[PDB]
Amino acid sequence: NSISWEVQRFDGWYNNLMEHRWGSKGSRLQRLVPASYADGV
Amino acid sequence: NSISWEVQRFDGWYNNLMEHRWGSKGSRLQRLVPASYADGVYQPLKEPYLPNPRHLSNRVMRGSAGQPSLRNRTVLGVFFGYHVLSDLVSVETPGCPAEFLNIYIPHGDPVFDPDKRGNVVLPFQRSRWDRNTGQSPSNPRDQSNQVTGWLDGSAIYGSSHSWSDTLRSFSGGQLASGPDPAFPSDSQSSLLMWMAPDPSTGQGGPRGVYAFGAQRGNREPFLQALGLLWFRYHNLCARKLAQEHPHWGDEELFQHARKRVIATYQNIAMYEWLPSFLKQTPPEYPGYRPFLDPSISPEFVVASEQFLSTMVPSGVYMRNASCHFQGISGALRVCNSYWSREHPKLQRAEDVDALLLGMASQIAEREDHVVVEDMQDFWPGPLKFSRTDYLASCLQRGRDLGLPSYTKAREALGLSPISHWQDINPALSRSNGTVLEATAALYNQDLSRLELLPGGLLESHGDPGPLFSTIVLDQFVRLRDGDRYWFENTRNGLFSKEEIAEIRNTSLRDILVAVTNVDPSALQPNVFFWLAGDPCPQPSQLSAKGLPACAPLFIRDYFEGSGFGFGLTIGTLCCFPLVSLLSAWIVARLRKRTVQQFKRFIENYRRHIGCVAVFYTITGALFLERAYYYAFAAHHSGITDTTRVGIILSRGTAASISFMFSYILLTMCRNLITFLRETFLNRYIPFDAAVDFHRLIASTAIILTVLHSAGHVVNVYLFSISPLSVLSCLFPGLFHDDGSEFPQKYYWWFFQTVPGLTGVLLLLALAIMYVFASHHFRRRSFRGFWLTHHLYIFLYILLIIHGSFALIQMPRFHIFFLVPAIIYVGDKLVSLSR
Amino acid sequence: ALGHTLPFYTGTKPTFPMDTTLAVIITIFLTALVTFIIILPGIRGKTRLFWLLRVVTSLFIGAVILAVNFSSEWSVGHVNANTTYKAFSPKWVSVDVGLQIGLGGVNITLTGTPVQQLNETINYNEAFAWRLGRSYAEEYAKALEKGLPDPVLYLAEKFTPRSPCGLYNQYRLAGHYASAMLWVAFLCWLLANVMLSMPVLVYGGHMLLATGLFQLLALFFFSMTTSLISPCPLRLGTAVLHTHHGPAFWITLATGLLCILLGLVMAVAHRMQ
Amino acid sequence: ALGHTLPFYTGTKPTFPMDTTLAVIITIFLTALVTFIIILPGIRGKTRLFWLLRVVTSLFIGAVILAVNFSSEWSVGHVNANTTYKAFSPKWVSVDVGLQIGLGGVNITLTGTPVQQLNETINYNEAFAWRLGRSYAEEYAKALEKGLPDPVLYLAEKFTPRSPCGLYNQYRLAGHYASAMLWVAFLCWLLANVMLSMPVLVYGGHMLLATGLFQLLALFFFSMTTSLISPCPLRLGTAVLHTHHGPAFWITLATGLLCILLGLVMAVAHRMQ
Numbered sequence A: 001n002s003i004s005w006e007v008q009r010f011d012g013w014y015n016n017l018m019e020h021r022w023g024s025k026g027s028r029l030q031r032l033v034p035a036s037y038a039d040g041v
Numbered sequence B: 001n002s003i004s005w006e007v008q009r010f011d012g013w014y015n016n017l018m019e020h021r022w023g024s025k026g027s028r029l030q031r032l033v034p035a036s037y038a039d040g041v042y043q044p045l046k047e048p049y050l051p052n053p054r055h056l057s058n059r060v061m062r063g064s065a066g067q068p069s070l071r072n073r074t075v076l077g078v079f080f081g082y083h084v085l086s087d088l089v090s091v092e093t094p095g096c097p098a099e100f101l102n103i104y105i106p107h108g109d110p111v112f113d114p115d116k117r118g119n120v121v122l123p124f125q126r127s128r129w130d131r132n133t134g135q136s137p138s139n140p141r142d143q144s145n146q147v148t149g150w151l152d153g154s155a156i157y158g159s160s161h162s163w164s165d166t167l168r169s170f171s172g173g174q175l176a177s178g179p180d181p182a183f184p185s186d187s188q189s190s191l192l193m194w195m196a197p198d199p200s201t202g203q204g205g206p207r208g209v210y211a212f213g214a215q216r217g218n219r220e221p222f223l224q225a226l227g228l229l230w231f232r233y234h235n236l237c238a239r240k241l242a243q244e245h246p247h248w249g250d251e252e253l254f255q256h257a258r259k260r261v262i263a264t265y266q267n268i269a270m271y272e273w274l275p276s277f278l279k280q281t282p283p284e285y286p287g288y289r290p291f292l293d294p295s296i297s298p299e300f301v302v303a304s305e306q307f308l309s310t311m312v313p314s315g316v317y318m319r320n321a322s323c324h325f326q327g328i329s330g331a332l333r334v335c336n337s338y339w340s341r342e343h344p345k346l347q348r349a350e351d352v353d354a355l356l357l358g359m360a361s362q363i364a365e366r367e368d369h370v371v372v373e374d375m376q377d378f379w380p381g382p383l384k385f386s387r388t389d390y391l392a393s394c395l396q397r398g399r400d401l402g403l404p405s406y407t408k409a410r411e412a413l414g415l416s417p418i419s420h421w422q423d424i425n426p427a428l429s430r431s432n433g434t435v436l437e438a439t440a441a442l443y444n445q446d447l448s449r450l451e452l453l454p455g456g457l458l459e460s461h462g463d464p465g466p467l468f469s470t471i472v473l474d475q476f477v478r479l480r481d482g483d484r485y486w487f488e489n490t491r492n493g494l495f496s497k498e499e500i501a502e503i504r505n506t507s508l509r510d511i512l513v514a515v516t517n518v519d520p521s522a523l524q525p526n527v528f529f530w531l532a533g534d535p536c537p538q539p540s541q542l543s544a545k546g547l548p549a550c551a552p553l554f555i556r557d558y559f560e561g562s563g564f565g566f567g568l569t570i571g572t573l574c575c576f577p578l579v580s581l582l583s584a585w586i587v588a589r590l591r592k593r594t595v596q597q598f599k600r601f602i603e604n605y606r607r608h609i610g611c612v613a614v615f616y617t618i619t620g621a622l623f624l625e626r627a628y629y630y631a632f633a634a635h636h637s638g639i640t641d642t643t644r645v646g647i648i649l650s651r652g653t654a655a656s657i658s659f660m661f662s663y664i665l666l667t668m669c670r671n672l673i674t675f676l677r678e679t680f681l682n683r684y685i686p687f688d689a690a691v692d693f694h695r696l697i698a699s700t701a702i703i704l705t706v707l708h709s710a711g712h713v714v715n716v717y718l719f720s721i722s723p724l725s726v727l728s729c730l731f732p733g734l735f736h737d738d739g740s741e742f743p744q745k746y747y748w749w750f751f752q753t754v755p756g757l758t759g760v761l762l763l764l765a766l767a768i769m770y771v772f773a774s775h776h777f778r779r780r781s782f783r784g785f786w787l788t789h790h791l792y793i794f795l796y797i798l799l800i801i802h803g804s805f806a807l808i809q810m811p812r813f814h815i816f817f818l819v820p821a822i823i824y825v826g827d828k829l830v831s832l833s834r
Numbered sequence C, D: 001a002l003g004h005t006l007p008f009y010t011g012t013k014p015t016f017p018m019d020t021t022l023a024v025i026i027t028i029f030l031t032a033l034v035t036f037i038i039i040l041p042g043i044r045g046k047t048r049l050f051w052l053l054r055v056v057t058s059l060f061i062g063a064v065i066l067a068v069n070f071s072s073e074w075s076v077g078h079v080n081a082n083t084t085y086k087a088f089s090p091k092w093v094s095v096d097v098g099l100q101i102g103l104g105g106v107n108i109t110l111t112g113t114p115v116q117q118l119n120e121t122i123n124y125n126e127a128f129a130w131r132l133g134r135s136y137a138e139e140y141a142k143a144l145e146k147g148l149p150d151p152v153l154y155l156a157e158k159f160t161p162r163s164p165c166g167l168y169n170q171y172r173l174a175g176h177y178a179s180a181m182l183w184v185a186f187l188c189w190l191l192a193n194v195m196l197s198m199p200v201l202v203y204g205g206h207m208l209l210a211t212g213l214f215q216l217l218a219l220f221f222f223s224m225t226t227s228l229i230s231p232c233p234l235r236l237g238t239a240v241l242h243t244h245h246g247p248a249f250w251i252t253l254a255t256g257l258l259c260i261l262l263g264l265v266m267a268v269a270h271r272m273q
């Protein structure tokens, strides 16, 4: 028809060729410094 | 103690804070262009669509060997590059299930088909892949990397901790040595190294196969020399620390020498080899980028490793410490040195020093499409031939990995488009012009089909070329900036500011002078090039003239001398009844010295018909269930690719006789029968015919064990002519795939396995128990029948042992056997008090 | 055999044509029918028809009660649409999308109008189960990791737990209780055949009524879902997907009314004569 | 109860002190012993000791045959070392590492010398099983994803399939056949107690010998492993780990010799008087 591109998914999957789960909904938050908890976990 | 940093893991895990699995061993190869398979998932492009590999290797990549390099690169650089790539990527291990992508030799090839026949197929096996990627089109198949993708010295120490443990001596902080302290120890011989045979002699023992960190480090003496260099250098560093810190243990010395060796290796591999391979200096270190993805791409395996073959020479020199070349002609032929075991020229330490120096002062081959014959004709073959074609097996591996085309890869990387064939290489088109025409004719003038390897070689004139340089440089930049343990990342605590400078000012000549105690004036400052003033020039450019010829081809036959013994074993197993019959004969000889009638029959034996029908339908249901599973539902384990009719016929009858032999005791539960004889069940089941039913279940369960034994006689034959890389996939824990491909003999399956050896005893027990319990001998001697008929105890014992040692499936006979055995032994105990 | 190539058996590996748990039932009851046909010539000439009908209908009812339970054609839908196919491709395919909602799961079928369109073979048939021993969310996450075509995942997530259209809880509970009623009806059929063999006319004719009433109760339980999937949109491009009552619904209705009729006939014929 | 805070039950959740599949056996056989002690005053005064011993030893043997099977103390090792602890930390801990190799798996224990060292609690006890229904490789990969301390993973991968030290196949086969022999010995113990209740002296005294011989056969099967883990290094920093025969080995030896002695005594006392 008139849709001459690849329509973007709503849940963010398959946006990256190698890491399919990057940016998807329900995915981890990736921290910059190791976690500072009371017991380490 | 003295270890004030976080020691680096051997398998590459936990190098990144966020993605723990990046760089680890056994991880995916992450591609740059979406996979181009035949169906979109896992199926390679093939010969009707793309040209024939062996026919393509003869038209472009073929020529003489006296072609000097443009940049005067030396052979030491080529094989140092091979060593670095063994550190980074390894994708040559075949994977399960066994899949083949064979190479059909065209009719009349003067090498692999001299006596002109039709079908001279060279086997070729697809490599290992990731088990979460091969099913659906929006996630095509991804192969897995057998080593750690980091540049972490995973070729000196191993890609796991248990591997590195088998390399250490645990005394002095050193790696284990042999009788000569200048060579590793070849003691471990079972699951460490690659035991591939020597193609020129057939030797295949583990004697002379040194232990390195790379599983295939003994491929050539010239790749062995680099491993010996980096082994001696560790043993040299860990011996100077023990002189400065005499109170350190063994783990401190090892972990302090390993750190320095890895850092020196990284410095050289990044700032001295790469600027020579690409002729482009990489950009300076910006700092650790925790978010850069450092994964290895499948296109990097072609841009780096498969390209280096255009530079490998035909012979390699050996040199004195002061410009003397006659082996310390005296060159080593490369085709006669693959997987060499104990080379009579490389047995001392001075000899390996001479090899390294001669490689340092010898200019490599020109960087172009041509490849010497020692690789495209005489490469060590992994299956059935002992020789293969390296280029034809590199084209078949690109198709197996799902690599993009040349014009498609040249677009995803942002390079200018290309329209004609005379634009791949204008200089090549002006000088020769007869190679591009042959390639066009092979591809039917379809430039959009030219694949990655033939395109990147035609594009290379003096250097890797525009497409290969881009892939290589980007890959190495991502490996440096994405690694936490890079020796320049000042926030890992490995080195101080002065040690980083002292490492950044080290070269490969410094290491060749440390290990090989020669004056530094015997080498050139940059041993990756030989320029017009450096010491000890070549005698002459080394073509393939004067060198000894390559050892010819021979085909390996696994079932060579097993013809007579196989016939004897089968004939003996078929003569088991004919010896028990003779024993019974002599035992007896010595013991002496209209339709209305049809419906009448039906109405008489309604109950018999019903009972027999139920029994046989249950046995048929069991047979059909197993046959269904092995015919329609077991493809993930490629066992029906080896034996299809055999495994179905032998695994259906197994499940049916597991029932016939278990429920044959309910016909001899005498007290239970005599109690149920007077019950409402008597209207349905004729209990008067309970022995005639015994002889029916018994004489119909032997016709199935004959089919079982025959099916496994066929299987054992097909298991003794299949390669070891197939059996390793079929029966793990019983076979392991090392280099030497040879299966176990036929008599190993029959007399040195649990099922095979209990099966023969079961056949003998049945051959006696059935011949003596026959109406011709039971009527003539009851004592013989009564004594031999007690073999059912031995029979059920053997049947419980037989199914154990789960080879194809977990045992099930005890499930069939619990209930009837309990009923029978209870009825037997009841008949003991009375 | 003969080993001269690699692999030894070079051939396409087959696939089973139909559903397995239905072929098993058909073969079992055909085997029983063949056995009784073999026994038939051994019965008196008069009662041949009286035995043939009494065994054929009993077996047919027992087989339907068991095949309808494992069937997945209670509510079915079908449409022909042009949809996207996969990721990293701007290409569209022309397919025949379908839904098949059973009692403990749903089967989704994507099949091209030509099966070979993009150098691929589009003949999918995927199953996501919500039985008491399964988890729909883990199955959907696993079918999202392994990348199925786009419309399959769309229809598969319409039934996922905690979706704006609350189909999961309703279909799960209704399927659970309909399956329980069907198992009770099967037990009543077994007891009817037992208490009919030994001479008990009243109790057999009264267990047939239960065999029918529990099938009708299963219909009542499953019919509490049609008022829920009607407003939720199932648009696939330019085509809408409407689901109606499948064959298993009407088959259960027919055999339930048959069992009820037989029970009433037996009771009446036991009273007067 | 009382809900005035959040959560309602604010307290530390407990952990079971010992192994569960051993406490079950101990409680079962203590219950049986208590029952027979309750019945005891209802027996004649003379045969009180003859019943007490005959039931206590029979129960003890039956309990040992069953507890040794599920035990994990066939070959055990122990050492005190300073090792690394976790990733992204250059800190070392002082622990008590130990190995406990059973018949169908291995238990690895890391325990600090002070349990609280790095603001953590180091009291691990991890199990990796290689039974016929399990996969060691998947368990090791799952224990590598979830990040256990460094020495635990080292010792856990020493036993992994396809390691330079081939312990997997040997320990797997030896454990499989030793467990089979122990099950056969348990069956023989059951039959000995049955054929001793009803008066059969010969057959009871002959089943006790089998109960002993199958325990000794289990010892023979498992003792084919000690010649394999001896050369493979288990270095943990500055300390080496040596494994020897655990308590389950000697317990099986003792009860096997006891059963054999009882069988021989019964046979002899049946022959002469």
Ligand SMILES: *[C@@H]1O[C@H](CO)[C@@H](O[C@@H]2O[C@H](CO)[C@@H](O[C@@H]3O[C@H](CO[C@H]4O[C@H](CO[C@H]5O[C@H](CO)[C@@H](O)[C@H](O)[C@@H]5O[C@H]5O[C@H](CO)[C@@H](O)[C@H](O)[C@@H]5O)[C@@H](O)[C@H](O[C@H]5O[C@H](CO)[C@@H](O)[C@H](O)[C@@H]5O[C@H]5O[C@H](CO)[C@@H](O)[C@H](O)[C@@H]5O)[C@@H]4O)[C@@H](O)[C@H](O[C@H]4O[C@H](CO)[C@@H](O)[C@H](O)[C@@H]4O[C@H]4O[C@H](CO)[C@@H](O)[C@H](O)[C@@H]4O[C@H]4O[C@H](CO)[C@@H](O)[C@H](O)[C@@H]4O)[C@@H]3O)[C@H](O)[C@H]2NC(C)=O)[C@H](O)[C@H]1NC(C)=O
Binding pocket: B039, B040, B041, B042, B097, B098, B099, B131, B134, B135, B136, B137, B632, B633, B634, B635, B636, B637, B638, C013, C015, C016, C017, C018, C019, C020, C071, C072, C107, C119, C120, C121, C122, C123, C124, C125, C126, C127
């Ligand atoms: C509802 O629904 C349900 C569901 O479905 C159903 O049920 C079902 O049914 C049926 C019957 O009919 C069935 O199913 C089926 O089956 C079949 C068989 O299976 C078997 O086989 C397989 C295969 O394999 C192979 O291949 C692969 C790839 O793919 C690989 O990887 C492997 O390795 C192999 O290979 C081999 O072979 C080949 C040949 O073939 C060769 O070539 C090579 O070389 C080699 O040799 C397998 O896979 C399987 O296995 C599996 O499973 C098992 C069991 O389960 C397991 O154990 C294993 O392990 C495996 O698993 C895995 O996976 C999974 C997933 O899948 C997961 O889960 C796990 O975990 C793992 O991972 C067996 O053995 C098959 O075939 C089929 O399939 C199909 O279909 C489906 C759906 O439809 C889908 O999904 C898939 O994918 C497929 O599809 C495809 O294909 C087709 C053809 O066939 C086509 O047509 C389509 O379209 C597609 O296509 C696509 O793709 C392709 C590729 O793939 C391409 O080519 C194209 O182009 C496109 O793209 C099925 O599955 C059964 O029985 C049942 N069940 C179940 C569960 O399934 C029911 O019925 C319903 N209902 C109603 C009422 O209706």
Ligand SMILES: *[C@@H]1O[C@H](CO)[C@@H](O[C@@H]2O[C@H](CO)[C@@H](O[C@@H]3O[C@H](CO[C@H]4O[C@H](CO[C@H]5O[C@H](CO)[C@@H](O)[C@H](O)[C@@H]5O[C@H]5O[C@H](CO)[C@@H](O)[C@H](O)[C@@H]5O)[C@@H](O)[C@H](O[C@H]5O[C@H](CO)[C@@H](O)[C@H](O)[C@@H]5O[C@H]5O[C@H](CO)[C@@H](O)[C@H](O)[C@@H]5O)[C@@H]4O)[C@@H](O)[C@H](O[C@H]4O[C@H](CO)[C@@H](O)[C@H](O)[C@@H]4O[C@H]4O[C@H](CO)[C@@H](O)[C@H](O)[C@@H]4O[C@H]4O[C@H](CO)[C@@H](O)[C@H](O)[C@@H]4O)[C@@H]3O)[C@H](O)[C@H]2NC(C)=O)[C@H](O)[C@H]1NC(C)=O
Binding pocket: A039, A040, A041, D013, D015, D016, D017, D018, D019, D020, D071, D072, D107, D119, D120, D121, D122, D123, D124, D125, D126, D127
């Ligand atoms: C041999 O060996 C074997 C093995 O071990 C054995 O067996 C065993 O035994 C025992 C007895 O004694 C046992 O075990 C044990 O158990 C226990 C309990 O459990 C339970 O609980 C848990 C907990 O949870 C919690 O927490 C978590 C965290 O952690 C979270 O997440 C959750 O959520 C929760 O939370 C909650 O709570 C808390 C409190 O507590 C609070 O706070 C909060 O808030 C909340 O509320 C859990 O987890 C569990 O669960 C699980 O499991 C189940 C079953 O299995 C399942 O179902 C589920 O799901 C889960 O699972 C998961 O996970 C897993 C893993 O784990 C996987 O597999 C899956 O898949 C999933 O994912 C339950 O419920 C426990 O606790 C324990 O643990 C411990 O231990 C171990 C070993 O040792 C380890 O591993 C762990 O980790 C732990 O440890 C830790 O802790 C401790 C304390 O407790 C300490 O001491 C240590 O040291 C450590 O620590 C560390 O960490 C921590 C944290 O975590 C920190 O704090 C510190 O600092 C450090 O860092 C155990 O497990 C049982 O019974 C048995 N079995 C088994 C299987 O296990 C035997 O016995 C042997 N043998 C001989 C002869 O000896």
Ligand code: HEC
Binding pocket: B661, B664, B665, B668, B691, B694, B695, B698, B699, B770, B773, B774, B775, B789, B792
């Ligand atoms: C799987 C074992 C098994 C096979 C095979 C087997 N039998 Fe037997 N048979 C038994 C057992 C068990 C008994 C019971 C012996 C007893 O306890 O007295 C028995 C008893 C008999 C008896 C004794 C009947 C009596 O007077 O009590 C006859 C006759 C007999 N078998 C004939 C046969 C014949 C004929 C065959 C086949 C050619 C056959 N058996 C095969 C297990 C077997």
Ligand code: HEC
Binding pocket: B654, B655, B657, B658, B705, B708, B709, B712, B713, B755, B756, B759, B760, B762, B763, B766, B799, B802, B803, B804, B805, B806, B807, B808, B809, B810, B811, B812, B813, B814
């Ligand atoms: C008396 C019957 C019998 C005879 C004779 C017999 N087998 Fe078997 N065999 C079985 C049964 C039953 C099984 C399946 C046991 C189970 O599933 O627990 C079996 C299974 C096997 C298995 C698979 C075992 C596994 O690990 O799953 C092999 C291999 C085998 N037999 C080989 C042979 C060979 C070779 C012979 C002789 C040439 C032979 N058998 C003769 C009954 C027999």
Ligand SMILES: CCCCCCCCCCCC(=O)OC[C@H](COP(=O)(O)OCC[N+](C)(C)C)OC(=O)CCCCCCCCCCC
Binding pocket: B617, B620, B621, B624, B625, B628, B633, C019, C020, C021, C024, C025, C027, C028, C031
């Ligand atoms: C109680 C009164 C009778 C009850 C009978 C019905 C109970 C339910 C049956 C479940 C069976 C099943 O499901 O079989 C499953 C297996 C294979 O499984 P799969 O396809 O991989 O699994 C997925 C299951 N799907 C498809 C539903 C998702 O198929 C088979 O074995 C077929 C083998 C043929 C059996 C032969 C019997 C024929 C009679 C003998 C003629 C001489």
Ligand SMILES: CCCCCCCCCCCC(=O)OC[C@H](COP(=O)([O-])O)OC(=O)CCCCCCCCCCC
Binding pocket: B605, B607, B608, B609, B611, B612, B613, B616, B617, B666, B667, B673, B685, B686, B687, B688, B689, B690, B692, B693, B696
């Ligand atoms: C799928 C295959 C289709 C089969 C269709 C045709 C089946 C043909 C069966 C033939 C029956 C028959 O001719 O009878 C021969 C013998 C004779 O018994 P007898 O009364 O002469 O002692 O009787 C027997 O052989 C006995 C068999 C049944 C006996 C069942 C006895 C139960 C025993 C005790 C079990 C606990």
Ligand SMILES: *[C@@H]1O[C@H](CO)[C@@H](O)[C@H](O)[C@H]1NC(C)=O
Binding pocket: B320, B321, B322, B324, B328
């Ligand atoms: C060079 O070789 C000659 C003879 O081959 C030998 O005498 C001389 O010692 C060698 N030079 C060195 C530095 O070893």
Ligand SMILES: *[C@@H]1O[C@H](CO)[C@@H](O)[C@H](O)[C@H]1NC(C)=O
Binding pocket: B505
């Ligand atoms: C490396 O160190 C030496 C030692 O002093 C120094 O002379 C030289 O300039 C440094 N840099 C080089 C060799 O590039």
Ligand SMILES: *[C@@H]1O[C@H](CO)[C@@H](O)[C@H](O)[C@H]1NC(C)=O
Binding pocket: B072, B363, B530, B531, B532, B533, B538
């Ligand atoms: C390369 O080597 C040759 C001799 O092998 C020499 O004549 C030439 O000068 C060298 N190249 C350069 C740039 O000096």
Ligand SMILES: *[C@@H]1O[C@H](CO)[C@@H](O)[C@H](O)[C@H]1NC(C)=O
Binding pocket: C080, C081, C082, C094, C238, C239
């Ligand atoms: C799919 O596209 C074709 C091409 O025009 C069109 O004829 C057809 O109607 C489309 N399908 C649907 C469901 O609209």
Ligand SMILES: *[C@@H]1O[C@H](CO)[C@@H](O)[C@H](O)[C@H]1NC(C)=O
Binding pocket: B037, B038, B049, C118, C119
């Ligand atoms: C895909 O199919 C089209 C049309 O059938 C054909 O032109 C094209 O070559 C095919 N592509 C491959 C990779 O087979």
Ligand SMILES: *[C@@H]1O[C@H](CO)[C@@H](O)[C@H](O)[C@H]1NC(C)=O
Binding pocket: D080, D081, D082, D094, D238, D239
């Ligand atoms: C651990 O470190 C302490 C600190 O010196 C030392 O005393 C102890 O011996 C070390 N442990 C071992 C096993 O060496």
Ligand SMILES: *[C@@H]1O[C@H](CO)[C@@H](O)[C@H](O)[C@H]1NC(C)=O
Binding pocket: A037, A038, D118, D119
């Ligand atoms: C950890 O323990 C040390 C010593 O007990 C203490 O000084 C420190 O504050 C603790 N850290 C945390 C985060 O509790």
